[PDB]
């Protein structure tokens, strides 16, 4: 039970996976031109504590 | 071989060892990056402008298809063939009980 | 004149059954998605000891 | 400098001729970062005025 | 006393502070293109002593 069908033949390297995140239409474009975080809050850990 | 002020060895271990054996070479690393791209954002009224007077002029006698809010993206594949992404593919996310 | 069409187009439902027709029939809902994806690259290192 | 150097979305007044009320400049690592009147509240809204 | 708070950010080096001075709108824009002084009069130096 439950298994993605194995494809017949690969043309190039192994296939990636893409996701989708809802975001308001009015977000500032330039937020994506430079390195950014898909979250929106760029927290991570290295710059900032708990 | 001498580099800087030091005197260091220099080796390749593909022929003396690892040659004609089904084990891969362990210096061929695997870098990792993560790409992101906005899909259908819409810029405000102030920064919608032609960079030149002679624009991507459409066929005379038709409304321009450019000012319309975009709903797709485009980028390049590994080899270089163009390959686009459209709202249609997002069906696998926004059409589910999880929503 | 165009405000009429704007107001009307702003009357579509938001539910998987509605997205089913919307997304496929070339209409733009009031979203903005962010595609993410991860790749891997084989490289040639130079180790020192 | 030239006739149609810039051009608004045809069918709309260009916001270029209006008197500006904001300035844009670059940050330490080149990310754009603007400042405008809205920030000057902490100076122009105070009894010291 | 009045401290803002201890933030968790530390974004990029310490953050500076911007000030605001009133000025007549009809000020010659050319006065800012080269080096200048915000006070308008360049006094203070061995320029003028009295």
- Does A24 contact C32 at a Cβ distance shorter than 8 Å? yes
Cα–Cα dist B37/C3, whole Å: 31
Partner-chain residue, chosen from C28, C38, C47, that has the shortest CB–CB distance to B27: C47
Q: Annotate D12-28 with b (16+ C-beta within 10 A) or e (fewer).
A: eeeeeeeeeeeeeeeee
Q: Which chains lie within 8 Å of chain C at 3 or more CB pairs, if any?
A: A, B
Tokens of C9: 């187009």
Tokens of C28: 């733009």
Cα–Cα dist C3/B19, whole Å: 73
Listed in sequence order, the residues at least 6 apart from B79 whose beta carbon sits closer than 8 Å to its beta carbon are A12
Closest C-alpha to A27, from A12, A13, A37: A37
| Contacts by residues A34-43 (CB-CB < 8 Å, ≥ 24 positions apart) | A34/D29, A34/D30, A34/D31, A36/B36, A38/B36, A38/C34, A38/C36
Tokens of B97: 């009980």
Tokens of D33: 């970062």
Listed in sequence order, the residues at least 6 apart from B76 whose beta carbon sits closer than 8 Å to its beta carbon are B82, B83
Determination technique for this entry: cryo-EM
Cα–Cα dist E15/D35, whole Å: 14
Closest C-alpha to C33, from B73, D48, B78, B30: B73
**Bridge partners, residue C38, by sequence:** B34
Alpha-carbon dihedral of residues A8, A11, A13, A18, nearest 10 degrees? -80
- The H-or-E segment that residue B73 falls in is strand B72-76
Cα–Cα dist D41/B30, whole Å: 52
Cα–Cα dist C19/A20, whole Å: 15
Secondary structure (3-state) at E14: coil
Alpha-carbon dihedral of residues D9, D12, D13, D15, nearest 10 degrees? -50
- Does A23 contact C33 at a Cβ distance shorter than 8 Å? yes
Cα–Cα dist B69/B35, whole Å: 23
Closest C-alpha to A22, from C21, B43, B38: B38
Cα–Cα dist A29/B51, whole Å: 18
- Does C37 contact A22 at a Cβ distance shorter than 8 Å? no
Q: What is the resolution of this structure in A?
A: 4.4
Secondary structure (3-state) at B4: coil
Cα–Cα dist E9/A49, whole Å: 8
Alpha carbon B5 to its chain centroid, in Å, reads: 42
**Bridge partners, residue B83, by sequence:** B75
CA distance, residue C22 to nearest chain B CA (Å):
9
Chains C and E touch (3+ CB pairs under 8 A): no
Tokens of E17: 């502070």
Task: Transcribe B34-69 into DSSP letters.
Answer: EEEEESS----STT-EESSSS-S---TTS--SSSSP
Neighbour count for residue C16 (Cβ, 10 Å): 13
- Does A38 contact C38 at a Cβ distance shorter than 8 Å? no
Listed in sequence order, the residues at least 6 apart from D37 whose beta carbon sits closer than 8 Å to its beta carbon are D21, D22
């Amino acid at each position: 039970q439950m298994l993605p069908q194995v494809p017949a033949g690969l043309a190039r390297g192994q296939q990636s996976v893409c996701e989708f995140i809802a975001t308001p239409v009015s977000v500032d474009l330039a937020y994506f031109r430079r390195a950014c975080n898909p979250r929106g809050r760029a927290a991570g850990e290295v710059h900032g504590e708990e | 071989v001498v580099v800087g002020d030091r005197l260091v060895f220099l080796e390749a271990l593909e022929k003396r060892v690892y040659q004609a054996t089904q084990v891969p070479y362990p210096l061929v690393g695997n870098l990792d990056v993560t790409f992101v791209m906005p899909l259908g954002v819409f810029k405000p009224a102030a920064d919608r402008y032609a960079r030149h007077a002679g624009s991507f002029a459409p066929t005379p006698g038709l409304p321009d298809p450019r000012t319309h809010p975009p709903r797709a993206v485009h980028f390049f594949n590994k080899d270089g063939v163009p390959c686009h992404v459209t709202f249609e593919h997002a069906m696998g996310t926004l059409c589910h009980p999880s929503f | 004149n165009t405000l009429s069409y704007a107001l009307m187009a702003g009357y579509f439902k938001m539910s998987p059954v509605a997205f089913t027709h919307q997304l496929r029939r070339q209409l733009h809902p009031g979203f903005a998605l962010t595609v993410v994806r991860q790749d891997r690259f084989a490289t040639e290192n130079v180790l020192f000891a």
